[PDB]
Design a protein around this ligand. Sequence first.
Ligand SMILES: [Cu+2]
Ligand SMILES: [Cu+2]
Ligand SMILES: [Cu+2]
Ligand SMILES: [Cu+2]
Ligand SMILES: [Cu+2]
Ligand SMILES: [Cu+2]
Ligand SMILES: [Cu+2]
Lengths: 466, 471
Amino acid sequence: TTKIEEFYAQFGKYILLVPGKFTGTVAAHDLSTGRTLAWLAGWNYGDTNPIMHHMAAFPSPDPYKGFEFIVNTQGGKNLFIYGIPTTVKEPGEGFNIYRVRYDGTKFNLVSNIAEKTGLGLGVHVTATPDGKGFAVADGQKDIFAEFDLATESVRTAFLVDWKPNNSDLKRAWLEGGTMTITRLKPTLPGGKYDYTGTKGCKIDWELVPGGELFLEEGKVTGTRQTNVVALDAFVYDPRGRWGALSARLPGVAIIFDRQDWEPVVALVGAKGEPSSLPVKKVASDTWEIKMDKVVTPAHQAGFSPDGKNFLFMNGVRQNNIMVWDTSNHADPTKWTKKAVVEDPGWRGSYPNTFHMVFTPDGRKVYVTLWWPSPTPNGIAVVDARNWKLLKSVDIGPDMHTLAITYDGKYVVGVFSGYQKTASGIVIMDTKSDEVVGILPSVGGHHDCVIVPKTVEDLRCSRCTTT
Amino acid sequence: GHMARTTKIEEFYAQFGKYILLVPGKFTGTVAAHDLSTGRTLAWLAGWNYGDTNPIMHHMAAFPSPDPYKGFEFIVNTQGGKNLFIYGIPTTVKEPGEGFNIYRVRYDGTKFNLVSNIAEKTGLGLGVHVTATPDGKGFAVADGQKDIFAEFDLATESVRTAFLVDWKPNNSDLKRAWLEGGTMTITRLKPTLPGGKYDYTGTKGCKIDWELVPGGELFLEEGKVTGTRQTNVVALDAFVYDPRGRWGALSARLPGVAIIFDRQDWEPVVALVGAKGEPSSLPVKKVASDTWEIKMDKVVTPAHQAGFSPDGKNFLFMNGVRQNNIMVWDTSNHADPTKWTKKAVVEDPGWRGSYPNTFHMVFTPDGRKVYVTLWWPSPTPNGIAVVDARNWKLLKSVDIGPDMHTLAITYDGKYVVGVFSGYQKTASGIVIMDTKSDEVVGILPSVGGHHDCVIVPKTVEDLRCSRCTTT
Ligand SMILES: [Cu+2]
Ligand SMILES: [Cu+2]
Ligand SMILES: [Cu+2]
Ligand SMILES: [Cu+2]
Ligand SMILES: [Cu+2]
Ligand SMILES: [Cu+2]
Ligand SMILES: [Cu+2]
């Protein structure tokens, strides 16, 4: 009685790429036809714990003829935090970083960059603004690195450590501390690092949403629980030069100079706290940030497409979107808080505002509203000129990432069932801010991307935000 | 004028009614349920999460539920061993997991629950078709590497019967081991281990080291399938049920025979011969208390998919490769399958090559039409044939996509729902066809290599057009 063609025809020619989390897959879907173009199952290749996690795709002149992406995995006890009644005793170690190419017919597993480099990193993956490199961060090890794609080599790698003022676990962040940033050097032959698999972990799983409190309360296992900062992402200024490394537990975004590979300033999320704190060089490869207190954790971080705003979402002890004026491209020490988005319905840990995407023209930003079961999860629409919440829309359980078609017309998001219940791909019209439909999805996806054609597209992809 | 307005998908889903599609993923390792009324995936499960290191999720059947949205149960099985290595995936795995699990899964209105591993309990690791019995209280599983099938009781998770089928070729040369005929021996198995357990877990019992893939029946002749008992394979496939009760048909791909069994006194009763130009059937002779034989002077062609019509008065068997057709028997005599006789054969000039193979099927509830997939190797688009199931004539053929597999039907008869599977590496999807117009209404995305699909039934009448009567 009704055909789907008009539904798909409205989108134009865009490919959605998704990781599957506990499914172990990655897949590309053609939004113009409904077909899944290709998929890959990590366990087929001998990855015995393929928790396919985060990803970024590089610009392709014609995605339908080919494209490339990076996808990483988690492992270890990350298998055990979603309530699945598995009897597995010894999970695979994970922390793989895979380069995958679509060739117009199928996916090709090109390389395991974690094995090649020795850096096993399991949290966000971001493409550089020129599309020629990528970063990966890890919040169990508190390491991040930027990689060159062509040579599959490490450009830089850093370790971040917390030395708490108060050694009591419940007070280890509230009462402040010193954050130390160390540029790593490889320790193994052939310029390799020694961080494969679970090696380097301070805690046994990535902190969950609101999970700072669970860490404080003694509910997260690991060997260095009071030294974690929970690095999350290295997001890029679309204008070049700078990246921002988010550290969830201290609620700080450390700005790095990608030319000199040095941290230059530390933005402090919390409302009522300074815009930033200085970074002091204490040795050739070591810098420190000193905090008298940590008012609140923070998570989502990123830049508007023009690079003139930077956002950091406070959570847990405050629940707001902090905005800095980053218009001065020359000097990040001058970046200053300019606005804060609040709502009477945003308090505490939930909603956890842990993904976003801007419209290409910068006028709006869409923000995930995540909650534990059974509260409906959804999407907030924020006015990114006046910095005010416009609307919230309920979607389903366990809402994750938001991408946008590069013409700015449709937001495409994923929800993931807490790895056990309802999941899907949701599409929202950006003019009406209404959901136009849900498509089925066998996936627990905590990421999604639309394959870009240009470097300009990356300004609204997995580059500037997560 | 091509982008004048926004379209919502609601009207598309609203047309289908309240039906849940269940799919296994083959190399994805998943099973999933999709709500055709909303587009949401209700739940999924990934076998590797539970420690199954080679979860090649193959076939499945669901049992009737008074309200599928509140809960339902199904069986899904897996393959194992070197089956990981036969779809061109460039894996470096040296020692694949043993697999051959049979899982009972319950949806509870929110999530899937892995209830039991029936293979571990019973000792029968069987990796090919799963079929529900017509009463919805038992199920069968067959395997085409081991050439064993069994019927199981759902409530007790126990084996009602198990049989081994073996080929003794007239000509010992692999190339001619089937063409020049042989003897098929059917043996009722008895368990050999404590607790009434069989000794067929994992890869144990395999005659060949991997399955005969879709379209690949003749690969064994050519020396492209390794194994220890290559010339003794029959490649059992499915045990499909007569909806009127009592009888089941066991498909044996390489001899091209469907062996009819009496489920009430577990014995084979007649062998239907697929090939066009060959007799309707051959006798089954009892040669010991637990042993029967069928003698064949020749095997003209292999066959694969099989099924009864909803009224049980027709039986279909799809000859492949050496002949591609739909062979039809008059099974109207429910008292005596030895009287079942060939009545029609569906052929087409376009089916004269090695491919397409006439493949999986689904009947309309009213029996008026049968939909039959048309399978080809890459790169030819695979499709769906629409057949008049009263006069046995091809009505239409439609192209869909690469590697087309199974078809289900909504139980009101209005929509066929099928899956295509990319040869485990390229395009995949769920396709929906309106049975009034015989037109595809749309494709939905699907991360899956599915060789099966079912719509969750509400009643035993629904099973007449589900994974019970046909493959
Ligand atoms: Cu994050
Ligand atoms: Cu997420
Ligand atoms: Cu995640
Ligand atoms: Cu137009
Ligand atoms: Cu079959
Ligand atoms: Cu099939
Ligand atoms: Cu199959």
